[PDB]
Amino acid sequence: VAQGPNGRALAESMNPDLLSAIQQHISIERYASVTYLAMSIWCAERELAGFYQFFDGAAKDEQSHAVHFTQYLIARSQSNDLQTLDAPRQNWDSLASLMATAFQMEADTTSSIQSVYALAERNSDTRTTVFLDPLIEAQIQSEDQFAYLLGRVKFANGDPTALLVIDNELRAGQTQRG
Amino acid sequence: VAQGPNGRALAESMNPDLLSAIQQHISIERYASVTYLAMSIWCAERELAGFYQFFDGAAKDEQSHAVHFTQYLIARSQSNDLQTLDAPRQNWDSLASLMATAFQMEADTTSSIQSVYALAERNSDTRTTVFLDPLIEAQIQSEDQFAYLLGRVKFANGDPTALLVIDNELRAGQTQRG
Amino acid sequence: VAQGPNGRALAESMNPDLLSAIQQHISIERYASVTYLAMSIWCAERELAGFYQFFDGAAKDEQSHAVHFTQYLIARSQSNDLQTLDAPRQNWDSLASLMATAFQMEADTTSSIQSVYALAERNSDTRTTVFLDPLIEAQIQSEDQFAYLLGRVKFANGDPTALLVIDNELRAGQTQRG
Amino acid sequence: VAQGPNGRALAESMNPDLLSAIQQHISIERYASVTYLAMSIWCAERELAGFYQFFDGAAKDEQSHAVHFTQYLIARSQSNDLQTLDAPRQNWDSLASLMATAFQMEADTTSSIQSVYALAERNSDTRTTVFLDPLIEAQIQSEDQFAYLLGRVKFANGDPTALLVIDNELRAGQTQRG
Ligand SMILES: [Cl-]
Ligand SMILES: [Cl-]
Ligand SMILES: [Cl-]
Ligand SMILES: [Cl-]
Ligand SMILES: [Fe+3]
Ligand SMILES: [Fe+3]
Ligand SMILES: [Fe+3]
Ligand SMILES: [Fe+3]
Ligand SMILES: [Fe+3]
Ligand SMILES: [Fe+3]
Ligand SMILES: [Fe+3]
Ligand SMILES: [Fe+3]
Ligand SMILES: [Fe+3]
Ligand SMILES: [Fe+3]
């Protein structure tokens, strides 16, 4: 029985480029987390309590996704390499602009997973594509959800009255088309 | 005991023009169904989640009405003839325009039933008028409901803020005067 | 943030040939639905109440599958295009012939999904293959089920007594190998 | 306040031909009752216990229908006139022949109601058409049910084995398409 790079028994070696891609993606999940924390704060600073609570939960969820990836590397007997985390964006001129950044962040998360997915297929790593399949499925739902929140905020067309109604929806947990 | 056109024992023959009228009306119910599906999609594309859920349920209800009619022909030992279904309308410039089409669709459904009703009376088919009586009663309630939804949307006068409030009413199931 | 063809925020563009293939497949699910409705009617006309109830439920399930696909296009910010629906087949000389058509309809549904799947892989659309994966899994179970119902009816070798026993199985919900 | 023919306060006079038609129809319901009793006995004599129980209940139901009509005449302040009741048919060469007589008996019951209905319309007696409307609705269901039982027995094509299976269905209360 061979030992993998993290010291555990190795079921099958992993291509180093694929390992680096996964380590890089863990950073993207962690960056999404701190970005949603920043967005939560921006919302709280403007008394948008429902948006604040939504993004506060979204930040914890993104961290959970990152940890989920670290567990996969452990399972594959590969080393984790937790990286320096950039500071998030923290300033937006409107809620609509913030929600656009949030949507792009989800689309960018999926793109990163897709890039890892393509590299795993290049290396015939079926464990990794199977591991990523449910995460892409969750990304479709997340993109649908953030397209819903962004589009609903844009529908409000900057009217504070409409944004308060949407804010109360989010505080109630009404955060998807349903 | 005579056998009816669908092969079952025949309680009483049905005039072929009346049969064709019923088969035609089944198509109208099926067309109402796919129209409400199209309207549900239009609403979902604009993040009008409550209107989407309402029309999604309305589409299933219209299909149930169609099946209810096929069961009556079975009960009368008459042949069903499921027809080609036209594509629905799929484009509207506003929610108010969509709701106007929806109201007209309900009024047109009732007109079709009324036409079948008149033909059954011409042929002294009391089974068919008795069968249609509760369906006309349900049409009155449906017309009242869609006049309510259309009128409430028109009252909003295109204000997104008011349409969001109405959207949330529909998501809660507040879809009639009550 | 770019807007997709249906107006929603776009996470990633979709190849137009892949979009048309998905729109075409939605038609196949809707056609399976009306085909199972026709089969339900054929069974009811022959007092095969269990087969009638089975196909009545199967028709609603196929419609649900179609709606599931329309929701995916919404999630991808792609336009739906609900198409004209052909009239179903409505005449069979025996229950065994009807069940053969039903089995082929399920196999043909899977073939259509497989064709969409191959086109998504050609375009590296991992969202679409992930979306279709569970639907292919459900197709395996559906093909297993309809091979079971077809084979059991063929085992009956046209004996009405055996078909009544099977009819009662279906009315009880005994519709799979289990 | 005028007194009606049965002595009670009279809300509106009834045409004597319409009264005789209703009195005649009460006889038809009573005759259906004793016919179903005879059919129950025929079935019991052949150990068809499920068919026996079905027709035993059907006989009581027909009597209830007759009483329902006598109550309407009371409500209209009209005299009842309970008539001599013919002896039922009591001999059949097969269960299929018996079920054909049963189906015709239901169709004939509806025809009698229809004849009363037409006479009430001739006399603009809207109380009577309203009273008969739900009874015609029940007749549609009864005709559907007896077409189902007759057709299922005919499907058995005289095989005792199939008739035993159907007999057990009826004993379990499985007496309609459902
Ligand atoms: Cl805004
Ligand atoms: Cl509007
Ligand atoms: Cl067969
Ligand atoms: Cl027989
Ligand atoms: Fe994530
Ligand atoms: Fe995310
Ligand atoms: Fe999978
Ligand atoms: Fe309808
Ligand atoms: Fe309707
Ligand atoms: Fe009525
Ligand atoms: Fe399907
Ligand atoms: Fe299927
Ligand atoms: Fe009766
Ligand atoms: Fe009866």
GROMACS .gro file of C-alpha atoms and ligand atoms in nm, chain D residues 29 32 61-62 65 106 109 139, ligand 13:
model
    9
  563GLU     CA    1  -8.733   0.264  -0.885
  566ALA     CA    2  -8.536  -0.184  -1.004
  595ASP     CA    3  -8.016   0.176  -0.283
  596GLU     CA    4  -8.295   0.163  -0.542
  599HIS     CA    5  -8.423   0.636  -0.450
  640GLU     CA    6  -8.021   0.144  -1.529
  643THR     CA    7  -8.434   0.418  -1.517
  673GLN     CA    8  -7.754   0.795  -1.322
  725FE      FE    9  -8.259   0.432  -0.889
   0.00000   0.00000   0.00000
